[PDB]
Design a protein around this motif. Structure first.
Motif, PDB file in Angstrom:
ATOM      1  N   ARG A   8      48.170  45.009  33.169  1.00  0.00           N
ATOM      2  CA  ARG A   8      48.420  44.639  34.547  1.00  0.00           C
ATOM      3  C   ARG A   8      47.916  43.227  34.868  1.00  0.00           C
ATOM      4  NH1 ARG A   8      48.659  49.059  38.107  1.00  0.00           N
ATOM      5  NH2 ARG A   8      46.808  48.573  39.386  1.00  0.00           N
TER       6      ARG A   8
ATOM      7  N   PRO B  78      56.217  36.310  46.946  1.00  0.00           N
ATOM      8  CA  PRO B  78      55.183  37.040  47.687  1.00  0.00           C
ATOM      9  C   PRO B  78      54.822  38.448  47.177  1.00  0.00           C
ATOM     10  CG  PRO B  78      57.224  36.853  48.951  1.00  0.00           C
ATOM     11  CD  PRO B  78      57.250  35.808  47.863  1.00  0.00           C
ATOM     12  N   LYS B  79      55.811  39.332  47.143  1.00  0.00           N
ATOM     13  CA  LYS B  79      55.596  40.707  46.726  1.00  0.00           C
ATOM     14  C   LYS B  79      55.353  40.990  45.249  1.00  0.00           C
ATOM     15  CE  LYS B  79      58.794  42.263  49.655  1.00  0.00           C
ATOM     16  NZ  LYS B  79      59.679  43.069  50.546  1.00  0.00           N
TER      17      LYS B  79
ATOM     18  N   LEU C  42      50.700  45.808  40.634  1.00  0.00           N
ATOM     19  CA  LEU C  42      49.583  46.731  40.786  1.00  0.00           C
ATOM     20  C   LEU C  42      50.069  48.146  41.163  1.00  0.00           C
ATOM     21  CD1 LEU C  42      47.882  44.131  42.970  1.00  0.00           C
ATOM     22  CD2 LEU C  42      46.463  45.075  41.203  1.00  0.00           C
ATOM     23  N   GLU C  43      51.332  48.266  41.557  1.00  0.00           N
ATOM     24  CA  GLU C  43      51.881  49.546  41.954  1.00  0.00           C
ATOM     25  C   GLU C  43      52.737  50.187  40.890  1.00  0.00           C
ATOM     26  OE1 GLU C  43      51.736  51.587  44.757  1.00  0.00           O
ATOM     27  OE2 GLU C  43      53.219  52.882  43.767  1.00  0.00           O
TER      28      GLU C  43
ATOM     29  N   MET D 282      37.149  46.051  39.519  1.00  0.00           N
ATOM     30  CA  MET D 282      37.535  47.307  38.949  1.00  0.00           C
ATOM     31  C   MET D 282      36.452  47.863  38.091  1.00  0.00           C
ATOM     32  SD  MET D 282      40.160  48.382  40.316  1.00  0.00           S
ATOM     33  CE  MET D 282      39.781  47.626  41.975  1.00  0.00           C
TER      34      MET D 282
ATOM     35  N   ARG E 288      44.598  54.501  43.937  1.00  0.00           N
ATOM     36  CA  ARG E 288      46.032  54.769  43.994  1.00  0.00           C
ATOM     37  C   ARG E 288      46.589  54.733  45.424  1.00  0.00           C
ATOM     38  NH1 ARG E 288      49.872  54.118  44.221  1.00  0.00           N
ATOM     39  NH2 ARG E 288      51.879  55.118  43.830  1.00  0.00           N
TER      40      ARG E 288
ATOM     41  N   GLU F  25      53.247  45.753  52.749  1.00  0.00           N
ATOM     42  CA  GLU F  25      53.871  44.478  52.423  1.00  0.00           C
ATOM     43  C   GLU F  25      55.370  44.527  52.489  1.00  0.00           C
ATOM     44  OE1 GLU F  25      50.739  41.737  49.919  1.00  0.00           O
ATOM     45  OE2 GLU F  25      52.520  42.438  48.792  1.00  0.00           O
TER      46      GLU F  25
ATOM     47  N   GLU G 237      47.824  36.127  45.349  1.00  0.00           N
ATOM     48  CA  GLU G 237      49.056  35.994  46.121  1.00  0.00           C
ATOM     49  C   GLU G 237      49.368  34.561  46.553  1.00  0.00           C
ATOM     50  OE1 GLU G 237      49.943  40.404  47.789  1.00  0.00           O
ATOM     51  OE2 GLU G 237      49.496  38.791  49.286  1.00  0.00           O
TER      52      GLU G 237
ATOM     53  N   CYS H 232      39.716  57.354  41.488  1.00  0.00           N
ATOM     54  CA  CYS H 232      41.106  57.112  41.132  1.00  0.00           C
ATOM     55  C   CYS H 232      42.063  57.227  42.266  1.00  0.00           C
ATOM     56  CB  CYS H 232      41.522  58.019  39.984  1.00  0.00           C
ATOM     57  SG  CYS H 232      40.560  57.614  38.493  1.00  0.00           S
TER      58      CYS H 232
ATOM     59  N   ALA I 212      50.560  52.198  38.849  1.00  0.00           N
ATOM     60  CA  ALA I 212      49.363  52.726  39.521  1.00  0.00           C
ATOM     61  C   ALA I 212      49.103  54.189  39.275  1.00  0.00           C
ATOM     62  CB  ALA I 212      49.405  52.465  41.008  1.00  0.00           C
ATOM     63  N   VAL I 213      50.147  55.003  39.238  1.00  0.00           N
ATOM     64  CA  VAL I 213      49.851  56.395  38.980  1.00  0.00           C
ATOM     65  C   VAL I 213      49.582  56.611  37.514  1.00  0.00           C
ATOM     66  CG1 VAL I 213      50.588  58.741  39.050  1.00  0.00           C
ATOM     67  CG2 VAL I 213      51.010  57.268  40.991  1.00  0.00           C
TER      68      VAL I 213
ATOM     69  N   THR J  57      49.072  62.021  41.971  1.00  0.00           N
ATOM     70  CA  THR J  57      48.409  61.018  41.169  1.00  0.00           C
ATOM     71  C   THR J  57      47.285  61.721  40.422  1.00  0.00           C
ATOM     72  OG1 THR J  57      47.428  58.788  41.220  1.00  0.00           O
ATOM     73  CG2 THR J  57      46.615  60.389  42.804  1.00  0.00           C
TER      74      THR J  57
ATOM     75  N   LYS K 295      52.438  37.808  52.809  1.00  0.00           N
ATOM     76  CA  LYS K 295      51.158  37.149  52.661  1.00  0.00           C
ATOM     77  C   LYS K 295      50.242  37.460  53.837  1.00  0.00           C
ATOM     78  CE  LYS K 295      48.155  35.017  50.711  1.00  0.00           C
ATOM     79  NZ  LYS K 295      46.767  35.164  51.172  1.00  0.00           N
TER      80      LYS K 295
ATOM     81  N   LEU L 269      43.064  39.805  45.569  1.00  0.00           N
ATOM     82  CA  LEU L 269      44.423  39.978  46.069  1.00  0.00           C
ATOM     83  C   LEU L 269      44.891  38.761  46.811  1.00  0.00           C
ATOM     84  CD1 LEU L 269      44.511  43.535  47.501  1.00  0.00           C
ATOM     85  CD2 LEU L 269      45.900  42.822  45.570  1.00  0.00           C
ATOM     86  N   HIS L 270      43.972  38.168  47.562  1.00  0.00           N
ATOM     87  CA  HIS L 270      44.248  36.993  48.364  1.00  0.00           C
ATOM     88  C   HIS L 270      44.562  35.785  47.536  1.00  0.00           C
ATOM     89  CE1 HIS L 270      43.911  33.774  51.241  1.00  0.00           C
ATOM     90  NE2 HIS L 270      42.945  33.239  50.515  1.00  0.00           N
TER      91      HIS L 270
ATOM     92  N   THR M 226      51.413  42.920  44.633  1.00  0.00           N
ATOM     93  CA  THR M 226      51.310  44.340  44.954  1.00  0.00           C
ATOM     94  C   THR M 226      52.289  45.155  44.121  1.00  0.00           C
ATOM     95  OG1 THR M 226      52.757  43.975  46.864  1.00  0.00           O
ATOM     96  CG2 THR M 226      50.375  44.056  47.278  1.00  0.00           C
TER      97      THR M 226
ATOM     98  N   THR N  26      47.329  40.553  52.897  1.00  0.00           N
ATOM     99  CA  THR N  26      46.112  40.144  52.209  1.00  0.00           C
ATOM    100  C   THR N  26      45.319  39.164  53.075  1.00  0.00           C
ATOM    101  OG1 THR N  26      47.528  38.618  50.942  1.00  0.00           O
ATOM    102  CG2 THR N  26      46.755  40.563  49.833  1.00  0.00           C
TER     103      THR N  26
ATOM    104  N   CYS O   1      45.765  55.405  37.260  1.00  0.00           N
ATOM    105  CA  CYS O   1      44.857  56.274  37.995  1.00  0.00           C
ATOM    106  C   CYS O   1      44.742  57.683  37.511  1.00  0.00           C
ATOM    107  CB  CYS O   1      45.260  56.304  39.450  1.00  0.00           C
ATOM    108  SG  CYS O   1      44.953  54.722  40.196  1.00  0.00           S
TER     109      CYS O   1
ATOM    110  N   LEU P 264      46.569  51.020  46.536  1.00  0.00           N
ATOM    111  CA  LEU P 264      47.637  50.252  45.946  1.00  0.00           C
ATOM    112  C   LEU P 264      48.976  50.626  46.578  1.00  0.00           C
ATOM    113  CD1 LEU P 264      46.588  49.800  42.200  1.00  0.00           C
ATOM    114  CD2 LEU P 264      46.206  48.455  44.245  1.00  0.00           C
TER     115      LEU P 264
ATOM    116  N   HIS Q 186      37.808  42.810  45.378  1.00  0.00           N
ATOM    117  CA  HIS Q 186      39.220  43.161  45.238  1.00  0.00           C
ATOM    118  C   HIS Q 186      40.104  42.450  46.230  1.00  0.00           C
ATOM    119  CE1 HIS Q 186      42.854  45.111  44.430  1.00  0.00           C
ATOM    120  NE2 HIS Q 186      42.882  45.791  45.563  1.00  0.00           N
ATOM    121  N   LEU Q 187      39.650  42.469  47.468  1.00  0.00           N
ATOM    122  CA  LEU Q 187      40.359  41.849  48.550  1.00  0.00           C
ATOM    123  C   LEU Q 187      40.521  40.371  48.388  1.00  0.00           C
ATOM    124  CD1 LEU Q 187      39.108  43.990  51.391  1.00  0.00           C
ATOM    125  CD2 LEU Q 187      41.414  43.736  50.510  1.00  0.00           C
TER     126      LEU Q 187
END
Lengths: 334, 264
Positions: A158, A112-113, A119-120, A72, B95, B105, A106, B91, A123-124, B24, B112, A102-103, A116, B115, A127, B98, A98-99
């Protein structure tokens, strides 16, 4: 001594894991450096994971977190485009990092969820708040604090939340975040007041507003204090993270002792220290700034001051009603 | 009929995106820029062709749409040639991503798996993208090679995702083979397509063709090999006969329309 060792070790670990990735995916040696520079960011994951009982889970959560924070931070240097590093490597390592974050996150996550999810949720807020931060330069503490609360407080919150969600049992969910959001703003203040000068680096918004009189030194001090409280508060909630206590006091006091003064003057915040005594039927009040000689006699503090020109007034007060900034002057002397 | 469903998704996808970008904080300038990405808002349709339930299908089609637009914004942010605000780009980009992670998901059999697929060849993709602009190509071999990552691998993971969020009986590797192949046909198209906009330098492959550093026939050959690779993919069972004229449409367009412009 010991826990200071663990932090140094965690920071070392995270730095490596981070640079090894930036390397493998193509980052030039220039950028790999830049990412190891980020010490504060690479260290923080350690504090966030403080409630994690199993050391192994802890090591992993910490570095995953490290990964995103850097990812970030890179996306940011990417918006400013003042880093002089290459925009492509910036962009791509950004994504790569980032990827992987995330991996790993998790894999340790409770549900599991959950990742995300977190992070959601905001998020708005994050951002768009970040968009508004730079849309308009703040102009008084009220607004500074407002901006900071999003690109500083939410940002780290977060990870605080993610750390809790990926850190196994006994995670004081909301508390970890509350620590993160508080601590985050403290260091965010530090950062602002910190001028490194490289490139075309602006004087910190808060620093500037401070040096321009648009923000009162004492107010900063109050906030710094509110944040230390909010922080200590959080690390108290059970099961507790006793370790972070000194950490909190460490950065708060740094801002106070080291940084704050580079912007204020001889007189930090608050009014100028005064001594109140009754002398010759009168009522007096002198600023320690005018107090020349000062000594002790039992439990009284006798002194002399500059009363008006070459006029030397005198006084004596109980050490009780004696202001700290006067009991100090006893020290310089004998 | 069929062309009708394509248009419908595109419309639906474009709106999920602009609606997202819009709220956003993206400016009216960027929102537009995002809905102007036509191919990209259309392709998730093709990727979801093996999907049965048309609700699940439209849900996966738009989620992937969010990420493709986000990744595309990430691009414009490294080229800084769109003259769009760097902050807005950054940004939104995050957004939209995400949201897309969150959506995919919720639609996947195993969360899983999202990712996993994203990490799997993340290094392959990311670095290949770096190497690509690090040393521009000089002959069709190198072009193809670079295209293989930024174009083929890029799309491939989305096809993988769609197979994973697309429910039962999706031919995973086939959905993907389609993506990596079709992906490269549109990437060549895109290269040979010159819009004039700002400082858009002639498409590397189009340049090489005009310089003589790449032979017309060898371009024609590739195009065909890719045409085949794709039909082959959509033929494997259960099959997506739908994509057949789609494959021909795009592959012939580059042949009949774009190639002649660059015969130099």
């Amino acid at each position: 001594v010991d826990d200071d060792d663990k932090m140094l070790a965690a920071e070392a670990a995270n730095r490596d894991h981070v640079t090894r990735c930036v390397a493998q995916t193509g980052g030039s040696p220039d950028l790999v450096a830049h990412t190891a520079a980020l010490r504060l960011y690479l260290r923080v994951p350690h504090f966030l994971t403080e409630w994690t009982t199993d050391p192994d889970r802890r090591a992993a959560v910490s570095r995953a977190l490290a990964l995103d924070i850097v990812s970030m931070k890179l996306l940011d240097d990417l918006m400013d485009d003042d880093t002089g590093l290459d925009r492509v490597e910036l962009a791509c390592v950004c994504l790569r990092l980032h990827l992987r974050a995330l991996h790993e996150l998790e894999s340790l996550a409770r549900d599991p969820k959950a990742v995300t999810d977190i992070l959601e949720q905001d998020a708005v807020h994050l951002c768009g708040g970040q968009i508004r931060t730079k849309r308009s330069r703040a102009t008084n503490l009220r607004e500074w604090r407002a901006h900071a609360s999003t690109y500083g407080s939410t940002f780290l919150g977060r990870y605080g939340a993610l750390a809790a969600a990926c850190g196994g049992e006994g995670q004081p969910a909301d508390s970890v975040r509350e620590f993160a959001e508080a601590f985050a703003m403290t260091i965010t203040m530090a950062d602002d007041l910190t001028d490194y000068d490289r490139n075309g680096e602006r004087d910190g918004n808060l620093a500037h507003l401070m040096r321009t009189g648009a923000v009162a030194g004492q107010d900063v001090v109050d906030l710094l204090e509110e944040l230390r409280g909010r922080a200590l508060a959080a690390v108290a909630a059970p099961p507790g993270a006793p370790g972070l206590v000194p950490v909190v006091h460490l950065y708060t006091d740094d801002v106070l002792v080291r940084l704050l003064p580079r912007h204020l003057g001889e007189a930090g915040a608050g009014a100028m220290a005064t001594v109140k005594f009754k002398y010759k039927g009168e009522e007096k009040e002198v600023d320690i700034s005018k107090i020349k000689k000062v000594w002790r006699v039992g439990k009284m503090i006798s002194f002399t001051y500059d009363e008006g020109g070459g006029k030397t007034g005198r006084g004596a007060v109980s050490e009780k009603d004696a202001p700290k900034e006067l009991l100090q002057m006893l020290e310089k002397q004998k």
